[PDB]
Design a protein around this ligand. Sequence first.
Ligand SMILES: CC(C)CCC[C@@H](C)[C@H]1CC[C@H]2[C@@H]3CC=C4C[C@@H](OC(=O)CCC(=O)O)CC[C@]4(C)[C@H]3CC[C@]12C
Ligand SMILES: Nc1ncnc2c1ncn2[C@@H]1O[C@H](COP(=O)(O)OP(=O)(O)OP(=O)(O)O)[C@@H](O)[C@H]1O
Ligand SMILES: Nc1ncnc2c1ncn2[C@@H]1O[C@H](COP(=O)(O)OP(=O)(O)O)[C@@H](O)[C@H]1O
Ligand SMILES: CCC(C)(C)/N=C(\NC#N)Nc1cccnc1
Ligand SMILES: [Mg+2]
Ligand SMILES: [Mg+2]
Length: 1141
Amino acid sequence: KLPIAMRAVTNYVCLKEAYEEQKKKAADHPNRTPSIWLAMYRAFGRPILLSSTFRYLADLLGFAGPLCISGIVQRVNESKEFLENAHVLAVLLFLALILQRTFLQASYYVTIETGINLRGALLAMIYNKILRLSTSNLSMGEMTLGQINNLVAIETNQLMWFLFLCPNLWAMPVQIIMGVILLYNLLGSSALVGAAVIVLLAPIQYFIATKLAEAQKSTLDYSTERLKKTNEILKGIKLLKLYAWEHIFCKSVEETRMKELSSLKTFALYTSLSIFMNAAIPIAAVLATFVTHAYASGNNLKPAEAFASLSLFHILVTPLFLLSTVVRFAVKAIISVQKLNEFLLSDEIGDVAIKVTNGYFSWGSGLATLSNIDIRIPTGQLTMIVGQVGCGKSSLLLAILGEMQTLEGKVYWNSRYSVAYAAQKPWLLNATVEENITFGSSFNRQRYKAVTDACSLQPDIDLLPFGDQTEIGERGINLSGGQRQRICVARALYQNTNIVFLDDPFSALDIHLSDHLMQEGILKFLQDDKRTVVLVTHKLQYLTHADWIIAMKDGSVLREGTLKDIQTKDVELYEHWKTLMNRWKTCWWYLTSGGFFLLFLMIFSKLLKHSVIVAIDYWLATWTSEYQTFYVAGFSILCGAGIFLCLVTSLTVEWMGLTAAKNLHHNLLNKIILGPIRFFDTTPLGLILNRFSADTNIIDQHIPPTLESLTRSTLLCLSAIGMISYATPVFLIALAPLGVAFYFIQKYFRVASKDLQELDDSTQLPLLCHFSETAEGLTTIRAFRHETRFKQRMLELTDTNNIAYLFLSAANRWLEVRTDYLGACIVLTASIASISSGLVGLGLLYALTITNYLNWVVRNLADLEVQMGAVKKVNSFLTMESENYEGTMDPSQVPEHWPQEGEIKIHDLCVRYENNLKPVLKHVKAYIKPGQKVGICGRTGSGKSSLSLAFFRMVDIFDGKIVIDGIDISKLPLHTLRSRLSIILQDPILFSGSIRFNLDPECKCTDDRLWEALEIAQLKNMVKSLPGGLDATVTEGGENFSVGQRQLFCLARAFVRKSSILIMDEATASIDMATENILQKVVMTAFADRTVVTIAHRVHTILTADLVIVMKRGNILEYDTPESLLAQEDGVFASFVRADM
Ligand SMILES: CC(C)CCC[C@@H](C)[C@H]1CC[C@H]2[C@@H]3CC=C4C[C@@H](OC(=O)CCC(=O)O)CC[C@]4(C)[C@H]3CC[C@]12C
Ligand SMILES: Nc1ncnc2c1ncn2[C@@H]1O[C@H](COP(=O)(O)OP(=O)(O)OP(=O)(O)O)[C@@H](O)[C@H]1O
Ligand SMILES: Nc1ncnc2c1ncn2[C@@H]1O[C@H](COP(=O)(O)OP(=O)(O)O)[C@@H](O)[C@H]1O
Ligand SMILES: CCC(C)(C)/N=C(\NC#N)Nc1cccnc1
Ligand SMILES: [Mg+2]
Ligand SMILES: [Mg+2]
């Protein structure tokens, strides 16, 4: 598989020991942070020392070119002592070249092996850090899951790509110094002047780098913001699309994109300047050197010296060809390692089964969210935690699990025992249903059936494509909220631990499923195993089953004891409970995105630049053929023209890159955000978000450099071939066999490359997903205490990915070695042809360039093929389906206040989510009067939510009309329909930013109206107490607030719009009973004029409703007042009321 030295385990151990030594040295002195660079050096330097040795040998051998060329020129111009003989020199040059290329490829091999080792070690390090990072980092707003994914995907890769090029950072200096020294032997003091010019690259390239670094950091800043926004949109599209806010958010994404593009433009401008310097300073150096030689030594050079010096200048130019790339990648790698070091230095986690005494706990800020927590959880008994929204229940569970800072007190666990945690926000992995349920336990079919039937999952799984083997979670079929919650509860029930922490498992479930779960699963299955159970529920009806009750109010514990103990001690609390219960083409597209002016300017300017630059060489050769003011002036104007042409050629490629990046991302975002909701239902969020996160990165920062290097190298190679052939025609024959060879090697590489490339991706998507599904659901992993299994899985995945990438690099090395030997053959053939008249001097001169730049032509062509494959995905998404926002209704017919009265009439409505599916709604017909209060109820899977989403045309209608206040909704534009009606979905979708931003993204609401909304939604006091008020922050996903508070914010978001018709879809699922009562009464007293249709989670709420509807499998069974339905003996509605009560 993978050699032991290349396993991620050994590399990780080495790097970790180096980093721990660094941490010791950092602890020694104040303000000295541990550094990743020194740890990486300690761990992996000796390999790089060997690679640098090989590179120095390669450069020493490379200097043999000038000497042999000069000898051949001298001997063409005019035993065993025949080493001057031209043909012997040619063969010796061939041997020197092949030896050089062998050493160079050896250095490349060593460095790629080391870089893969280190990517493995760094991914293991940051993964263990994930398994140790405190969730308060992600909940208080320090960092995001997206930032961690960015680390893993982009920043580690950038560090690796830099470490592929690291030897150059000291090999290129040496080679450029040596060169100058050798020039000093041929040209005398003249070389010094040229040397000085060359040395100016050292100051310059520092300055530029500085700028680049800043410009990069800013980009990485704005990018991270942009992506954040993007992700939220893709995760909350439904809400946005239901509120008509799609474009308000698209505009903010585009603003951040404009900032990122400006930073990218600064980076591109300075990259262009670095290219211009690296190209022109050589021309300036040659100009200075040869003018000084012409006017200092009265004699012109003999041809031998002339071609020797010109060859030495070529050898100088070769490093400067790649200097720009190495500085670019070193800057980006410095930024990436800064981010990695910031991450790796962050905050981390710190009878009676559990006893918390004198506990004061806080969520990081240093202010106590819990206080005077004196609790005990009896062993093998049902503990139930009760309290209104935001009262420290989930906080209590996560405090016992040591997930939050402990200010005072202690938790005793009669080290922690494993405990089955069913998080309130269900976390599902990217494996099958069976893998999610078993979750690392040996499959027992009897126990599996017990769990599955206790959670009623069997009816739902048998529907799925393959019941127990269908892939779930992101990157799989998306289950409903209730199904995911019941799968998570099944996982909690299946693991063979002795403590089960079930956090509100009945939020998404209906009455029947919840009652079945309670009775069978929790009152029979869990008690047969004699397991301790701690339930966090608002269902007061189940308090009779509880053995121990922990009431919580405002962070502290109100009272603790059995029901009788509470009744005798806290009479008021028991009475309160009682009252509450009531007892390719893509490459062409990328090139042409500039409009045919940038493209043709690029091609013509490049051709003209190389024309001038070869004319300079021909001029030097012919000028030294003499051994004059005419020659000097011609040379000077030629050099000036070359410098200006370099300046022009530098900017065109970068400008093309900027233009194409902007256009591609703009089209992608807009077309995505206009897609129908079905597209998001079917497609994983991961694919769409990958487009932006990774492919936009490729399109912005990785295609332009590849393209410019490819164009320069290919023009150099074609020019050298043409020059050689013009000098020696016969070379053309040699070109045909060689040509064939080239073709074939290319061919073979491709058929393998593709395959290997695919493998790489296929092996990396799992790894990334792993890092994603541990960062999410970290608390569940660490509550089951399964960190070891997940670390082992990460090591396995990273080793597989390393194998794939190593084989890919091996194929690349195969192609590079073959093409280098082919270039050496080109050199030898052209050399023999030239030896057997000014033409042939420059012809033989360019043969070395042929090898040097043919390698790069091939490599960059491969890189560009991969990156154009990236571009293809955006261009593919451009073919999506688009929702019909136009609408047939004339805008004149729509009154200024369309839902003026609020009457609705549904006639023969039939709905199916996608073509060729079952009709979820079947001929429903109902007329809600203006100012009517309608309550819709029923089991899960009865089409209540479909009837809700019908009004907003988010479900495709086969037949029927929805005539809202005298206009068929089918005709109106989508935006008018979806802006003048307000829906309160069940799952809260809360964006990042201030409270104000979530309550009105447009900024078009008075502060007074926001306070009104928050007062109806029962969040006035909490927002008042928050530090910033209405400017207080909401971290991504609303994690800093409880679930009930997230739902209440989602209710406030609907109370501000103040439209005439409200559709409340199971809004009080997560809210407790007392908050729910007061909220319903206040909402009814406030919206008494409007028409509100409430899909009810508890039928009690809809007992005081003007009209009631009970849906069963897409049909309205009963349509009448709640009094009439209650009067019926054995009616469905009557049955619902008895069970809930
Ligand atoms: C000109 C000949 C003799 C050698 C050609 C390369 C060298 C000039 C060396 C010496 C100085 C080096 C540069 C000086 C230091 C930097 C900055 C470094 O980035 C940073 O220092 C962080 C940015 C910051 O300091 O705020 C990236 C590498 C780079 C460009 C180095 C790249 C390699 C350089 C150009
Ligand atoms: N992840 C978090 N990070 C920081 N503060 C939090 C976090 N979760 C909750 N809080 C704060 O803790 C306080 C108590 O909320 P808690 O998490 O205990 O909710 P809960 O009572 O379990 O929720 P509910 O019963 O509505 O589902 C709230 O004021 C909230 O501001
Ligand atoms: N996103 C979806 N795509 C296709 N079909 C769906 C989707 N959601 C639900 N359904 C189907 O529609 C029916 C009713 O679902 P739903 O409207 O969610 O019921 P509820 O009223 O309980 O929310 C179910 O039988 C289910 O198969
Ligand atoms: C040394 C600078 C001058 C302009 C005198 N000569 C160059 N400059 C470049 N580039 N010659 C050359 C040609 C082709 C491939 N490599 C090098
Ligand atoms: Mg909770
Ligand atoms: Mg529903």
